């Protein structure tokens, strides 16, 4: 347990460690404070990322960048990130028009997504039932990675670069002098610091409360769920397949051979985990509509995790001005794993230069009180 640290990042999930990682390789001294183990929490319950098919400039630029960092660090640290694509199945003119429009904006900013044909979609993913799919949105540079593998990797490098990662260490309060942060109070003593980063997404409020932040930054934990099937021949389902029409289903195959996935089925603001029978039924219905072979496959286990939701499904990433050297990177609303490498870069630059290459202001912490939802 250190007793002084230039920067203290709270939370040691993909986001927390990825931020530390950038700060540390940039020469800065960072210690992360995680109340359980590195990568417990949502990162531990997470799907397999990673996507550039978003619907607005900022997110598309951030994810384009993010994917570059996934390629770089993936091979540079040896942790495995397969670019198998993302496949959005479309079923009507409503959807086609909308995606034609999404792809257009994706393209402008260097994400070369194509609108594709049913039979093309079925070449990729031969087991896809193609009978009512009319087009599909396809990008071959989206991919999947194991959130735990990737976090642990970034973790050991961050340490190598000199970051302190503190594991069974919970933040409980702050020593705030004037509007200066002076220390982060924990269950194992106080650490002196002037700069802190809140990366606890689902718990963000708690950390905000302890800090006395009076700005409304609504981030609620919601229960989302996933299923895993028995393992299957390698490369049977390579890309992440999305079906908005069939219940916001997403499914793909794991590196073990599993076929993992969930659906939209959200359960109101709660910290409760524990899977539900209703999810079990619904996921089975949706998946087997999208790929019929799944009918013959054993379900092994089901689990749950938090989406840390904001009103506009975008994170709050920025400096909080009224507390001196408080930052927030939280509320990733279900897609925070894929963003992490890029938000690491952004937060580092904020701390370090006062501004960022990427359009970080889209994720303005102040947008909500100002009434400006994205």
């Amino acid at each position: 347990l250190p007793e002084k640290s230039e920067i203290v990042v709270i939370g040691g999930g993909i986001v927390g460690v990825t931020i530390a990682h950038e700060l540390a390789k940039r020469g800065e001294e960072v210690t992360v404070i995680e109340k359980r183990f590195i990568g417990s929490g949502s990162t531990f319950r997470c799907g397999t990322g990673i996507r550039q098919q978003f619907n607005d400039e900022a997110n598309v630029r951030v994810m384009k960048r993010s994917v570059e960092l996934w390629k770089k660090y993936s091979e540079e640290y040896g942790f495995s990130f397969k670019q198998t694509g993302y496949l959005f199945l479309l079923y009507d003119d409503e959807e086609v028009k909308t995606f034609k429009r999404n792809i257009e904006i994706q393209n402008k900013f260097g994400v070369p997504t194509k609108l594709i044909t049913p039979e093309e979609a079925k070449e990729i993913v031969p087991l896809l039932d193609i009978s009512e799919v009319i087009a599909a949105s396809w990008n071959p540079t989206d991919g999947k990675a194991d959130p735990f593998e990737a976090t642990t990797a970034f973790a050991v490098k961050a340490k190598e670069y000199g970051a302190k990662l503190l594991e069974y260490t919970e933040v409980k309060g702050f020593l705030i002098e004037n509007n200066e942060i002076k220390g982060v109070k924990t269950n194992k003593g106080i650490i002196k610091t002037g700069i802190v980063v809140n990366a606890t997404n689902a718990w963000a409020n708690l950390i905000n409360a302890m800090a006395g932040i009076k700005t409304k930054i609504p981030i609620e934990p919601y229960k989302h769920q996933a299923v895993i099937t028995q393992p299957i021949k390698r490369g049977t389902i390579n890309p992440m397949v999305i079906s908005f029409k069939y219940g916001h289903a997403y499914l793909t195959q794991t590196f073990h051979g599993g076929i993992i996935g969930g659906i939209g089925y959200e359960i109101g603001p709660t910290y409760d985990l524990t899977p539900t029978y209703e999810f079990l039924r619904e996921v089975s219905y949706y998946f087997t509509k999208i790929i019929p072979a799944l009918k013959n496959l054993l379900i092994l286990r089901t689990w749950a995790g938090y989406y840390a939701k904001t009103p506009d499904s975008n994170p709050a990433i920025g400096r909080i001005e009224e507390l001196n050297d408080y930052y927030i990177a939280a509320g990733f609303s279900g897609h925070g794993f894929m963003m992490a490498p890029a938000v690491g870069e952004m937060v580092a630059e904020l701390i370090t230069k006062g501004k960022t290459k990427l359009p970080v202001e889209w994720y303005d912490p102040y947008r909500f009180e100002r009434g400006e939802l994205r």
Binding site: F37, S40, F44, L127, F148, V227, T229, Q230, P231, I232, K233, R234, H256, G257, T274, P275, T276, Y277, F279, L280, R281, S284, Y285, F287, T288, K289, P292, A293, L294, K295, N296, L297, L298, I299, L300, R301, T302, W303
Partner: protein, 484 residues
């Protein structure tokens, strides 16, 4: 008579084909048993190339008429049947009933029957059993049993005999878990391929214990039989594990008594290091490097309560007497409205578990306003001290670790040992790094062992190493069965 028949079978003779070869089987027999009778042990290979049978941990996927990936144990033999081996991951490519009931008893051993007998005096119960017969572990024995001073299988017949029309029996039926809806509990159940939803006011988990798995070198290879499977083939079907049989483990006498009854020759190897053989076992080696020639090894190292249904039902655990148990209030409740009875609670004689089921059924009968006397069962139960189990010192240094298998899937003892050696002691993490307890048993036959290894390498006491909880479907269900 086939070579491993213990009796001449008088069922309707039938003919099947294994890898092209013509074999004789009888109607009603399950695939792996018909193949055993015909001296065939090796039924599948794991994804990393390990040969496997049907009588220890792990699934048995087989091509059964050009349909890949069917489970051998679940398939009844049928005339003209074309059976072939396949990869582990080879799959095939191509009207919900609602029943409302007072209690829903999960598990049909002496505890379950016990509960049902007590309960049907006034209430309507579902007796759920995945097993196809209604005894418990008891139906695996046929040796005189204490408590009911009477033959094991004769007692079962008597007890089943006494069931009302107030008891709906669900044979060959897998409960997927328990879901509290406040006003009732939902116990979704799978039989054949129909899904049935049982809505009940009360539930009892009469769920049983499972046989512990011994850690020695090729413990997964064909011709190794876990206690329960050896007893099943001998006593339920009447087929020998092999012509000459090695027996090991601390409850080896239970097995030896059956062997002696059937006149099956055997050796008693108190401490097994290794089993060897091409397709099947043909030698076992002890810790002093003595070899014995045999056709099969049977291990019996004690049963431990199956904790999965307990923790998915939302119960909490306690370590005592060498095993994990449910934490119960003073009324055998895991949680309001969910009772636990039998070898799910603790290890003790069949008769005791029978009483505990009656006890549990009586409490709920009292809950319902009927005048029952749970305490007469209470005081009968105290006459039975629950059994202990020795905690195994796995001689890790003395084993070739990559040969000794911890879980069903991939997962050698070496893989687990490696991660522990690199500092990781949290089973949550071990589960993820190695795939321990992520296979088609859900840790049933390996979690506790994984814990024992951590504990052994760490010094950390077992009563402090908490166990990853069981989740949504406590039993494998596929997936088509769950739409719409």
């Amino acid at each position: 008579m086939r070579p491993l028949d213990l009796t001449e079978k008088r069922g309707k003779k039938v003919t099947i084909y294994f890898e092209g070869k013509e074999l004789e089987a009888y109607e009603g027999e399950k695939l792996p048993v018909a193949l055993l009778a015909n001296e065939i042990y090796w039924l599948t290979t794991s994804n990393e190339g390990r040969k496997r049978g049907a009588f220890t941990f792990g699934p048995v996927p087989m091509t059964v008429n050009g349909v890949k990936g069917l489970e051998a144990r679940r398939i009844k033999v049928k005339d003209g049947m074309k059976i072939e081996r396949q990869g582990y991951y080879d799959f095939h490519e191509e009207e919900i009933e609602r029943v409302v009931v007072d209690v829903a008893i999960i598990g049909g051993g002496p505890a379950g029957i016990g509960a049902a007998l007590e309960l049907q005096q006034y209430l309507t119960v579902a007796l759920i059993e995945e097993r196809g017969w209604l005894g418990g572990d008891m139906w695996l024995k046929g040796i005189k049993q204490e408590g009911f001073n009477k033959d094991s299988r004769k007692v079962v017949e008597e007890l089943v005999g006494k069931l009302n029309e107030n008891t709906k029996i669900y044979l060959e039926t897998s409960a997927l878990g328990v879901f509290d809806k406040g006003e009732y509990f939902l116990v979704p159940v799978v039989r054949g391929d129909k899904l049935i939803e049982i809505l009940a006011k009360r539930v009892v988990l009469a769920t049983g214990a499972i046989d512990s798995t011994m850690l020695f070198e090729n413990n997964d290879m064909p011709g190794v039989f876990r206690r329960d499977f050896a007893l099943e083939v001998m006593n339920v079907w009447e087929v020998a594990p092999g012509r000459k049989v090695a027996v090991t483990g601390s409850k080896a006498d239970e097995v030896i008594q059956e062997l002696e009854r059937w006149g099956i020759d055997y050796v008693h190897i108190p401490n097994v290091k290794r089993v060897e053989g091409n397709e099947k076992v043909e030698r076992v080696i002890d810790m002093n490097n003595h070899e014995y020639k045999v056709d099969a090894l049977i291990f019996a190292d004690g049963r431990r309560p199956d904790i999965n249904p307990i923790t998915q039902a939302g119960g909490k655990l306690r370590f005592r007497r060498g095993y994990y148990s449910p934490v119960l209030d003073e009324y055998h409740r895991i949680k309001d409205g969910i009772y636990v009875a039998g070898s799910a609670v603790s290890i003790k004689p069949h008769y005791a578990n029978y009483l505990e089921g009656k006890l549990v059924g009586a409490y709920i009968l009292k809950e319902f306003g009927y005048d029952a006397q749970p305490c007469i069962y209470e005081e009968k139960l105290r006459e039975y001290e629950p059994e202990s189990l020795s905690i195994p010192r796995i001689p890790l240094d003395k084993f070739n670790l990559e040969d000794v298998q911890i879980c069903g899937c991939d997962v050698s003892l070496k893989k687990v040992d490696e991660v522990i050696r690199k500092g990781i002691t949290d089973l949550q993490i071990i589960k993820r790094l190695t795939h321990l307890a992520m296979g088609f048993c859900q840790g049933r036959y390996c979690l506790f062992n994984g814990a024992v290894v951590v504990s052994q390498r760490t010094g950390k006491k077992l009563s402090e190493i908490d166990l990853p909880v069981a989740r949504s479907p406590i039993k494998n269900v596929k997936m088509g069965i769950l739409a719409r």
